[PDB]
């Protein structure tokens, strides 16, 4: 009973939690990349005001 | 007026030039087709306009004309029994011009200018009027529509038209300074209508559902939020509230959802009867429909139009219930507009001012004393559609800070056809304490004790559910098995409610009270009989258990006799038992 | 009309090129790009201003240069030529034939974007459609005018189920009365990102059945440019709407894979530098998906109808993935395939527990069909839920914690699947299946049938398993 | 001066910002008044000035403003508030204007609202024990006079009731300290940010019933008020509190309703200017901005007055690692954290003892202040409750029947502790009652388990039975 309980309840919940945390971290990384791209564009556009 | 030309087109965003003198948040007319747009940014000689219609086919150089006024709705007689677009256009007057399809550019007045209304004056020359006072009355479908002075008007009365039949655009009262008061007036949708004072909500809002009326009540000026994943039952719950509640006027806002859910309401409502006046159900309902395939920028305006109309009906003394079908679509529209403006997002792409907008929308609800000296109320029930059932998303978390009740739906119950599928462990209500004096005089004097006892039984069963899942139901003793079976009886016979059944769809307070009393009487008798060595098997096989299960299908006119017979049978069958 | 050409190309990078002095280019127009070699590419204006216009190209930009390239205008609104004679033809997903037959002559030219339907002009979908599959027609019945997707897996037979439904779809105008007349039927088939093997299998099935004579195929292969995948379902829905609302046809629309459409949408959106959404998909994917699924339904005062059955696959069976989650918020139900039922050899592997049909209540009932249909369905749902629950209890605790009452639930749950769900290539009926549904409810006691009224219990209770 | 200069030539309006070009004579941080075409006047503040153009944030909404008729005029170089001793018993909005219908006050001084830092040499150690009447606060998480003790709440949890009860029952015990003089009632400064009508009405009725509105000052910023006004309200409230406390020897208790709304307004302004974000989009300077508010409480050597702060904030999704609770915990001196599990069981007040903290607890307790057995009893209670929680975790795996005879005592101790020490309701308890109940609970455990209590205290106090009190 203990073996079946572990293999049928405990492991899949931990796997789902791991997947959820990975998705959240990846989304935050993508948002950071977008922000850095925007401010790089701003920096490049600043120098072109008067050449 | 201020007049210019189009400089740049990109989706629903149009940049006009030559617009020096235009004001923020005004209404502009874009292009030769006469589309409707709103200023949201001024920059030198240019202006940023978001268009509420389809922008395909526009060309650079078309004129833009600024009307100089903000977005406003027309408030007056003729709004009931109506279906409106996102910017208050009558759909039935559009179909007669354009066919089965919706084409941009069609302009129709919101209030019909050809109908004649019976006029009855109540003021006399020489009187002085203020904002919110009543000038006269006009009959509607059972109601008595009152003609109100606009909130910004003050002066003395010079001449009043006598009784008769007039259109909505004929002046009825002329003041001393030459101001003419008609049967209708316009109000900006982004300004809350003024009131004298706000009162503490103290009377319940009866929804007709047992779980929402007993366990998690909502008052007559409160706000409630019902989040859940797809297929949970938000729309069915809101439509049952529209069908069976005790509100005088119901305003339904279909913000960004399916078109079949509006056709069902338009078709089935005229054949139903409202609970309090006996007339057609559609005679008290106002629909604002903006489906998912309509222009996105019109989703934001529909919420403000609906809440402004609901506030207008509040000023006449009625009790108005407002149902917003989805606020996440409004959040998506805000995200789209912010992306077009190229603003920096806060979380999930949403603009950082979303919580302020949500708090400004929900704050318009409440029980007030109107400027005319009457009492009115507005209740708001908004539904949230979180992506994938995640309750940590920004829209859900920004709503929990202002609402007074939180009805959480569950996918596990909805998958097993256990409706209304309300999670009774994650839900709460903050109006329970204030509504107790009403219950102590309007249903019975022992109602709160009964409700608390049943809540305690549910808590005990939920506690035992951890034990039973690892040892099985047989290994528990009789005192625990009794609690398990009683909790199952409560779950399958009291909380569950079919919204499509002929009788079970609506439940009064006294019927639920009687079911509660019967269940607890059975529990007490079984608890007494357990100590005499009687087996659980002998108790669970008793025929009186089926009387509890079938109790919710008895009509209201036959319930007290059934209740008396069931109580006598409960008190007798255990006496017959050993 | 005589053409006009622009040569003011000032910037090319990736899929975007900028055109100078493009004042008279309308927004959203369709353009033709020609280079020095004479090859012609497609493009669409996505942003226009006083200084330049921005055009995204329908395919790769190799060979373009700022000297010899010219851009011309095709039409301000993208349109498709339609005709009644398209029945039996095949198209590549852009409107051009691929069967070697001469091109059709356009009766009308309609915009492929379409227009929203007025909610007043609609009416209630109220007609039952016999799919030929028992687990659908009883518990999750399909109503004419519904959009009912199928939630598949990565190794589950969804294409075969779709082909069987397309072969066995009928109108059955006998039980609710209706017109009692021989009614025309049509199937519009659209495939996005399909492979060569699946293409051959689909065309072979349609030819062997003989259903090709009343069908139109919009087949888009996986090696085609990705824009032709985007426009594929819109042209199919344009053809379906034209047929249904100008010739009183009852059309059926099948979309093979929405996941490829979503991945193409993400790839297109990422090339325009837009803020991503939940898993990198664009934030406006809800609106883009809604503009497709909302073109089905029925219209008051007309005889035709449009019914959509999209098929999509859940990556790693994740029901919380953005694509199935956003699809479920628009459509009116779902049919979910179960991998565990497929593991034991049951075909079709439809799981009744997470399946749902929202328009069931008005498509079945008194006079429309057998009177007992709704109570039969909900009692079967409750009993199956209880049986699977106690079966999951047994798999941990063991058989020692079972009384005969729970053993009856176990026997019912084990019984249901092999008699009702497994059907192979059969073409069963509705009155056939209702007796089988009543038979399985006979083993449980009368007291378990709380929801069913005493009248329906009294009339029909008691029958053994009728599988022979 | 006594002259007004109008800067016409606005070139940009979007969101909460507004640009005026030829306005190089405006000082940084100055206050301006924005005049509409129809005569309406709205406030503003300069946040960046240059010889090219100046950047102005607008407090109210921007509806109706146009680039042709709008003008900007200067009010004062430094943002200042006119305070007085007669403002007790009044009500104000978020920017200090009266809303109670009474005529405006006459200022005795005009103080800057940004404040100035306190010299650490001039400070003194807070050592006055405050008896709040709650056992989980008086015994385990003692609050001293001059402390910043925020309340970490949730969505549906009753933080407002706890704050009102603390404000109602707060008193010092001069007989135990050895002073013996007549204490004065606490003056209350109440600052609201984005508060709803329900909570505002509850607070107003509570203050009316207690009769404390004659000693209270109220700054109210409702939910329908403009969002950017929330930047100024805590600064005005703390300016008034500091003035009263360090110029008239008042004992001031300051309550801030919701710091989350302040953080939302700060995020709106920071994202408008596109600063480098911290975590979850909040600006990088949020730590300094929050520190300029909390650090204005304390006690000053050579003066009788004091300032005590009780911020209230709601943790989103009950997440302790969210940036707002994280920074608030890094700045303040402890927290009182509410538990939803205790709230679902009907226990009021639902204060969770384990995640709570009080840094200044050791200064105010001990011999000559409360009693000599305070700290050891607190430590032993904490250790025993932690053991009980761990055994509760174990019985979810092995079952309670498989326990030894030792762990059942800890389990019953945890249950009785939650049911008796924490669940006290609306009654007021003295420190002696709470210590008596705590010693009654500790007598359930064997005498040999009390490793953190000196044997003298065990001999003096152990042995009482709980049935003499709650029997
Ligand atoms: N109270 C109820 N009684 C009976 N059946 C119900 C009830 N509530 C929901 N259902 C069933 O569940 C379905 C849920 O549909 P509904 O439109 O209410 O869901 P929803 O949560 O609003 O969905 P969506 O997010 O897709 O808009 C109904 O069509 C019906 O079949
Ligand atoms: Mg819905």
């Amino acid at each position: 009973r203990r073996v079946n309980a572990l293999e049928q309840v405990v492991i899949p919940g931990i796997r789902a939690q791991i997947r959820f945390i990975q998705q959240v971290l990846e989304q935050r990384e993508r948002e950071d990349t977008f922000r850095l791209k925007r401010i790089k564009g701003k920096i490049e556009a600043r120098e072109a005001e008067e050449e | 007026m201020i007049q210019g030309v189009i400089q740049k087109i990109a989706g629903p965003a149009v940049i006009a030039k030559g617009m020096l003198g235009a004001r923020m948040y005004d209404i502009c007319k874009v292009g030769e087709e006469g589309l409707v747009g709103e200023i949201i940014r001024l920059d030198g000689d240019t202006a940023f306009v978001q268009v509420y219609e389809d922008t395909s086919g526009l060309k650079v150089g078309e004129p833009v004309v600024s009307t100089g006024l903000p977005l406003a709705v027309e408030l007056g007689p003729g709004m009931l029994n109506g279906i409106y677009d996102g910017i208050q256009r009558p759909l039935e007057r559009i179909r007669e011009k354009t066919g089965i399809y919706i084409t941009r550019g069609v302009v129709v007045h919101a209030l019909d200018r050809e109908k004649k209304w019976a006029w009855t004056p109540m003021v006399k020359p020489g009187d002085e009027v203020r904002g919110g006072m009543v000038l006269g009355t006009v009959p509607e479908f059972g109601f008595t529509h009152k003609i109100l002075v606009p909130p910004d008007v003050r002066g003395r009365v010079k001449e009043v038209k006598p009784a008769g039949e007039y259109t909505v655009e004929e002046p009825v009262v002329v003041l001393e300074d030459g101001t003419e008061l008609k049967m209708y007036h316009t109000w900006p949708v982004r300004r809350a209508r003024p009131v004298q004072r706000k009162l503490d909500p103290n009377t319940p809002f009866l929804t007709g559902m047992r779980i929402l009326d007993v366990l998690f009540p909502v008052a007559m000026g409160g706000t409630a939020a019902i989040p859940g994943p797809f297929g949970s039952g938000k729309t069915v719950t809101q439509q049952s509230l529209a069908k069976w509640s005790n509100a005088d006027v119901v305003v339904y806002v279909g913000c960004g959802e399916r078109g079949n859910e509006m056709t069902d309401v338009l078709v089935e409502f005229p054949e139903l009867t409202d609970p309090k006046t006996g007339g057609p159900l559609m005679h008290r309902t106002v629909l604002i429909a903006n489906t998912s395939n309509m222009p996105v920028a019109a989703r934001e305006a529909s919420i403000y139009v609906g809440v402004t109309i609901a506030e207008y009906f509040r000023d006449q003394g009625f009790s108005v219930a407002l149902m917003a079908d989805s606020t996440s679509r409004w959040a998506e529209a805000l995200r789209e507009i912010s992306s077009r403006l190229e603003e920096m997002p806060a979380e999930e792409g949403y603009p950082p001012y979303l919580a302020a907008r949500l708090a400004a929308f929900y704050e318009r609800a409440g029980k007030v004393i109107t400027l005319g000296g009457e009492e009115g109320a507005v209740t708001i029930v908004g539904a949230v559609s979180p992506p994938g059932g995640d309750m940590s998303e920004p829209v859900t978390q920004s709503t929990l800070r202002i609402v007074g009740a939180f009805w959480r739906l569950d996918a596990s119950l909805a998958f097993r056809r256990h409706f209304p599928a309300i999670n009774w462990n994650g839900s709460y209500s903050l109006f329970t304490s204030a509504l107790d004096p009403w219950y102590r005089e309007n249903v019975a004097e022992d109602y709160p004790e009964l409700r608390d006892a049943i809540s305690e039984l549910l808590q005990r069963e939920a506690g035992l559910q951890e034990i039973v899942q690892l040892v099985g139901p047989d290994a528990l003793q009789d005192a625990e098995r009794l609690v398990i079976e009683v909790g199952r009886i409560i779950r399958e016979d009291f909380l569950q409610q079919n919204a499509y059944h002929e009788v079970d769809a609506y439940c009064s307070m006294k019927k639920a009270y009687g079911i509660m009393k019967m269940i607890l009487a059975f529990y007490k008798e079984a608890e007494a009989a357990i100590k005499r060595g009687v087996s659980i098997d002998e108790i669970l096989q008793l025929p009186v258990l089926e009387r509890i299960g079938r109790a919710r299908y008895v009509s209201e006119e036959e319930f007290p006799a059934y209740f008396e017979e069931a109580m006598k049978e409960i008190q007798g069958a255990f006496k017959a038992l050993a | 009309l005589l053409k006009k050409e622009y040569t003011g190309i000032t910037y090319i990078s990736g899929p975007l090129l900028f055109v100078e002095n493009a004042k008279d280019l309308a927004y959203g127009a369709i353009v033709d790009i020609k280079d020095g070699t004479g090859r012609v590419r497609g493009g669409q204006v996505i942003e226009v201003s006083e200084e330049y216009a921005v055009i995204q190209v329908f395919e790769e930009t190799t060979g373009l240069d700022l000297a010899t390239t010219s851009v011309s205008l095709v039409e301000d609104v993208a349109r498709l030529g339609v005709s009644k004679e398209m029945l039996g033809r095949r198209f590549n997903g852009i409107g051009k034939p691929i069967d070697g037959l001469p091109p059709i002559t356009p009766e009308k030219r309609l915009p492929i974007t379409g227009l929203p339907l007025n909610p007043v002009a609609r009416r209630k979908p109220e007609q039952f459609i016999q799919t030929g599959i028992s687990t659908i027609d009883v518990m999750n019945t399909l109503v004419r005018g519904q959009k009912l997707p199928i939630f598949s897996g990565s190794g589950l037979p969804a294409n075969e189920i779709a082909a069987q439904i397309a072969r066995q779809a009928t109108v059955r105008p006998d039980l609710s009365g209706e017109g009692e007349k021989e009614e025309p039927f049509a199937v519009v088939f659209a495939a996005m990102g399909i492979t060569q093997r699946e293409l051959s299998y689909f065309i072979q099935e349609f030819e062997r059945t003989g259903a090709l004579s009343r069908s139109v195929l919009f087949l888009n292969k996986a090696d085609d440019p990705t824009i032709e995948r985007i426009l594929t379902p819109r042209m199919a829905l344009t053809v379906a709407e034209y047929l249904a609302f100008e010739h009183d046809y009852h059309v059926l629309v099948i979309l093979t894979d929405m996941t490829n459409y979503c991945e193409a949408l993400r790839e297109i959106g990422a090339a325009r530098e837009e803020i991503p959404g939940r898993r990198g998909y664009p934030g406006y994917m809800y609106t883009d998906l809604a503009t497709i699924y909302e073109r089905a339904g029925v219209v008051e005062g007309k005889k035709g109808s449009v019914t959509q059955i999209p098929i999509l696959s859940m990556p790693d069976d994740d029901r919380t993935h953005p694509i199935p989650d956003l699809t479920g918020y628009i459509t009116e139900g779902q049919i979910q395939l179960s991998r565990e039922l497929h593991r034991k050899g049951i075909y079709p592997p439809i799981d009744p527990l997470p399946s749902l049909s929202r328009l069931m209540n008005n498509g079945v009932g008194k006079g429309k069909t057998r009177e007992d249909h709704k109570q039969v369905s909900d009692q079967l749902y409750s009993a199956y839920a209880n049986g699977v629950d106690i079966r999951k209890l047994v798999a941990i605790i063991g058989e020692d914690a079972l009384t005969e009452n729970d053993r009856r639930y176990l026997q019912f749950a084990d019984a249901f699947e092999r008699f009702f769900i497994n059907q192979g290539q059969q073409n069963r009926s509705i009155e056939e299946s209702l007796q089988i549904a009543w038979a399985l409810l006979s083993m449980l006691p009368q007291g378990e049938l709380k929801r069913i009224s005493k009248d329906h219990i009294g009339k029909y209770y008691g029958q053994k398993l009728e599988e022979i």
Side-chain angles (χ1 to χ4, degrees), chain B residues 95 258 260 264 388 417 550, chain C residues 124 300 325 330 355 449:
Chain B
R95 182 189 179 196
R258 309 180 187 85
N260 275 328
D264 252 4
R417 313 301 145 120
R550 302 265 181 165
Chain C
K124 292 171 64 87
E300 164 210 289
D325 188 54
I330 307 163
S355 299
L449 317 187

Side-chain angles (χ1 to χ4, degrees), chain B residues 165-207:
Chain B
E165 288 202 320
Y166 308 96
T167 61
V168 308
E169 60 184 29
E170 281 169 69
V172 284
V173 170
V174 178
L175 298 192
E176 305 263 0
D177 61 340
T179 304
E180 301 164 314
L181 299 177
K182 282 161 279 193
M183 300 206 160
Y184 78 106
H185 68 277
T186 60
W187 183 258
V189 300
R190 321 193 93 102
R191 271 178 65 200
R193 294 184 60 96
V195 288
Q196 276 203 1
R197 291 192 307 119
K198 291 224 167 179
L199 313 177
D200 310 33
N202 68 323
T203 67
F205 171 65
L206 303 165
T207 72

Side-chain angles (χ1 to χ4, degrees), chain B residues 259-278:
Chain B
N260 275 328
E261 268 55 57
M262 292 276 118
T263 316
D264 252 4
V265 177
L266 270 174
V267 166
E268 91 188 339
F269 269 29
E271 282 80 355
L272 291 174
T273 303
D274 57 348
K276 56 199 309 184
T277 82

Side-chain angles (χ1 to χ4, degrees), chain C residues 77-196:
Chain C
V77 185
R79 295 174 190 270
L80 171 66
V82 284
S83 170
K84 195 170 183 178
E85 72 205 277
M86 304 175 87
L87 284 157
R89 302 295 309 280
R90 302 204 283 261
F91 299 89
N92 61 339
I94 212 64
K96 310 294 288 189
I98 55 176
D99 42 17
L101 261 62
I104 59 107
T105 63
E107 300 269 8
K108 306 174 81 171
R109 303 197 84 238
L110 298 174
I112 49 177
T113 66
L115 282 165
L117 270 169
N118 204 328
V120 184
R122 287 181 183 265
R123 63 172 159 96
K124 292 171 64 87
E126 58 211 326
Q127 292 311 125
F128 153 78
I129 280 191
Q130 167 189 296
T131 67
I133 301 175
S134 304
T135 51
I136 291 182
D137 299 357
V138 172
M139 313 205 31
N140 307 277
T141 172
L142 172 75
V143 175
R144 204 184 316 164
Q146 199 173 6
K147 30 173 180 297
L148 191 81
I150 295 174
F151 278 8
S152 175
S154 59
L156 304 187
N159 287 354
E160 302 88 315
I161 288 180
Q164 176 169 352
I165 280 180
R167 283 162 29 203
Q168 297 182 327
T170 196
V171 71
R172 269 290 300 260
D174 65 329
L175 187 47
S176 317
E178 204 71 6
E180 304 178 330
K181 56 206 293 268
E182 222 149 54
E183 190 86 337
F185 203 93
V187 176
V188 172
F189 183 82
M192 321 156 214
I194 205 171
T195 194
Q196 184 71 37

Side-chain angles (χ1 to χ4, degrees), chain B residues 98-118:
Chain B
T98 67
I100 75 181
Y101 287 116
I102 302 181
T103 53
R104 61 185 188 188
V106 179
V107 47
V108 188
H109 300 296
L111 301 183
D112 205 5
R113 303 303 209 256
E114 283 83 357
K115 194 176 176 189
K116 302 271 192 165
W117 302 91

